[PDB]
């Protein structure tokens, strides 16, 4: 079962002369359990390709099959429910809820799914303890450290144990030691969850960590 399938995804931004065809055809099949890392120069549409991969927007043309559904066909509501069902996110600025505590931030996806609060909070506190944040359960995000905030976001991602994990520059605002800890903790927690993950970053060693690395060159994908 190919969890993520890409077929000649062409994407253009603008109209007329300034219609920047950022993507001119993408073909990619992602097997389940694979570790794929997307690399390339910043601003070369890597973020655009990441967004179209998770169905945040629609492209000029192409076929996107996430968990075997025609993303180009469903509306935004179906895309949102599919994202909640099978998809997790990790961001460079980690987009944590500024007004909720870490336990709330990591239990939020379950409440969106409508899952029972009891087992959800049990699993959430178990994961947070696995992250060694036992003294920050009620802490607001502002009084958390960058590594702590990344840990909270990562726990939110792994609360529902999604099949796919879209992450971009997870170490963007952290140093080398914190970046390495978050990265290898990500890889660890992923390897027993069997979740395909897509990283959008420029770090060479981080891409080398993934089993497969694809570079985005002028609208096309190239194996490296």
């Amino acid at each position: 079962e190919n969890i993520v399938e890409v077929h000649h995804l062409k994407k253009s931004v603008g109209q007329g002369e300034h219609e920047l065809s950022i993507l001119t055809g993408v073909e990619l099949v992602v097997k389940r359990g694979e570790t794929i890392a997307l690399v390339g120069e910043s601003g070369s549409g890597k973020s655009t390709l990441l967004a179209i991969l998770a169905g945040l927007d629609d492209g000029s043309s192409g076929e996107v099959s996430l968990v075997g559904q025609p993303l180009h066909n469903m509306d935004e509501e179906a895309r949102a429910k599919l994202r909640a069902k099978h998809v997790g996110f990790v961001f460079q600025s980690f987009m944590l809820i500024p007004t909720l505590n870490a336990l709330e931030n990591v239990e939020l996806p379950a409440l969106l799914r409508g899952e029972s609060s009891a087992e959800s909070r049990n699993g959430a506190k178990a994961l947070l303890e696995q992250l060694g944040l036992g003294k920050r359960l009620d802490h607001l995000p502002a009084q958390l450290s960058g590594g702590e905030q990344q840990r909270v976001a990562l726990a939110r991602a792994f609360n529902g144990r999604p099949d796919v994990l879209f992450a971009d520059e997870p170490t963007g605002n952290l140093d080398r030691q914190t970046g390495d800890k978050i990265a290898d903790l990500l890889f660890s927690l992923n390897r027993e969850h069997g979740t395909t993950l897509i990283m959008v970053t420029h770090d060479l060693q981080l891409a080398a960590r993934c089993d497969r690395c694809l570079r985005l060159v002028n609208g096309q994908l190239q194996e490296e």
Binding site: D57, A80, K81, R83, F89, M95, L100
Partner: protein, 799 residues
Amino acid sequence: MIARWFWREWRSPSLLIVWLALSLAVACVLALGNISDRMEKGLSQQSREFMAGDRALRSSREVPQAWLEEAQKRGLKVGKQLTFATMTFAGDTPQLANVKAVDDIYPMYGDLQTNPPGLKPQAGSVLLAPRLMALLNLKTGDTIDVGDATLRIAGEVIQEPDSGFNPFQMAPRLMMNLADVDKTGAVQPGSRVTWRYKFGGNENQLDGYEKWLLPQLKPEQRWYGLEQDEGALGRSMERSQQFLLLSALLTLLLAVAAVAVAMNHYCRSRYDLVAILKTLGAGRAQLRKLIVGQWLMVLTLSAVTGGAIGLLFENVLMVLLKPVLPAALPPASLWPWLWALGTMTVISLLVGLRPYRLLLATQPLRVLRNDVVANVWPLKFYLPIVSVVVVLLLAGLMGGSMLLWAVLAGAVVLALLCGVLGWMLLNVLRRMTLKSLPLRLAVSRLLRQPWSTLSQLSAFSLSFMLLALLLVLRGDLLDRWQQQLPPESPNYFLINIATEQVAPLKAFLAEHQIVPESFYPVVRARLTAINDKPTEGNEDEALNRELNLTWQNTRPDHNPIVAGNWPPKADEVSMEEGLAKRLNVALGDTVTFMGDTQEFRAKVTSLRKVDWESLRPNFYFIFPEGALDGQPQSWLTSFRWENGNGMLTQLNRQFPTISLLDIGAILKQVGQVLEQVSRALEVMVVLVTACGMLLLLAQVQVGMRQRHQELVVWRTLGAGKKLLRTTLWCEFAMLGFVSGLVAAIGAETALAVLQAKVFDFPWEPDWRLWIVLPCSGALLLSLFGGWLGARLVKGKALF
């Protein structure tokens, strides 16, 4: 979960200010609508029992007893009232006061409020207004002389079931009975008496009696009912309602602007938050439920707190407005609560539907791109619909009230003109060199942020319009009194003199070093027909009262004549320019007057511009000399005096019948009335300037990010902490300062236009306002700026 979410989100400055702005809006609308409804309920229940019946007859003469006997045999209760003006004795201190004669039947409806309560006018007993006791240094149980009798003070007059709502009253109230009226002997025929007879009972008998007595109604007698007793009191109460509605509309419009800017900024901030929710799988339904629930919860909380503070304001207003309000008032109804809730919810909806749809339709791509914003409902289509619904709502509130639409439009245009004038002042201040770096930087920052600064300056300009107008009325009326010594300008009026009394008082004038001013032979008569067309029905103030007529051999001194010829001959009358314009009366027109004895006729032959606003003897009609000899020729005159009051006392003792009017006493009385309404209006100004303060907090909150990064730039460049704190101090202080100068300019223009076109007094610059008002604005704004700088600069998180 959601409880924690709401509690933690409610601490956000933009949402907090939105909540408090809605609270203030619902509070002000609830308090104002509640006071209006208390007034309306009071007037309705009073019209029920001012009347104490259904059909009343007013006259300048005592109607035949046969009609009253016919009413009595018709199973109807008859209530007697007789309003008159005479003098009272504070020992040896005379004072003008209004007496009312009522029979023991009254009050047959409602309740009478006296101090002590449960009192009635008996033989030898008089009830007096508390203000008169304060002026006459008399107390309950004493004996006071009125006219030609001395009667004991039964008690105070807290509020009467037949005592109207006349804040601009000239005389206190003297409740006393008809038997004592005949006993005093001071009542004279043809005097300024007014007989008001009420009839009560079942509807059918009252209607039959009204139909029976309709053919027997003189032009001096008016028959009216529950709502037909609308003369000057109805106009006064309607004007009060319109004024309070105007104030409420202004403050709620300011609140609408505040919530608009604050909550638009709040939604702009929460764009990323809602985008994160959407990305994490928040469906449109669940997100819709969450946002609408949060909005409803904040709406309800704001409604509750606004209702509480509005109840507090209502109590404050009712404590404060005692001198110009009835002591007892009907309890508030639930309708003002519905008014407030409906108004607040409709304004919240019409300001938030666009942000609501923006948040609902926010593109999740905003997570990846901080610049991409969902472009839905462009302003080019949003503004027309909100404008049309707002104007439709205002019309539905008003209907066809052109006057209040015009005043509101003028006020808004004045706010805009104040804003643009302030911007011009800022530009000219920049264009001249600034030695001080903080001042130059601040004025540059003000100018290069046009929309925000102009809106803010307009808001504070309007609030300071209100405050400056308050200080104007009080202090400038004091100075106007000091300025109330123009040339000629008679001070003391003497009305209702018989012919035979003319010679001695003149000798009195000839003996107490008094120059005899103009001597008007005046007859009281009501206009019945203009060009034989009956004037009964028109709502003119002059028509619904006893018009005063006079004849002079020579031309009036104060009154210029524009059209026609002087002096008019027999059956030829001079006409006032203003009333002729307002009553479409031209030269050669025909006017018919119902006098005390005979109905007489005149032909409008000359037009004169009588400044009724000028403090001079003003009359619409001037008859030829010796034209109203058949009528009882009452008299009027005036004189100027400034030394002592013993001459007034001895003149009153010599002539108890003559009616005296002190311009100084009535001026002081209206001055303290204006002071009381000034305290009311300063409460209103506190509320509206709190709303403007909210607008300031919101308009700076939308600039938190930009201003904060500006301070970061300054800190990096090398600007000192003290320099930045002083920069904010001087910025806000000068913003308030220029707002104060704008307010001073507006007030000065108001004084100039009032003293040049309306009051024709010479204009002087009131430096007191110019030195008090802008300084106060600057001090308040600098206090705010100091707090803001402490919150921004003192924090070490600047790096």
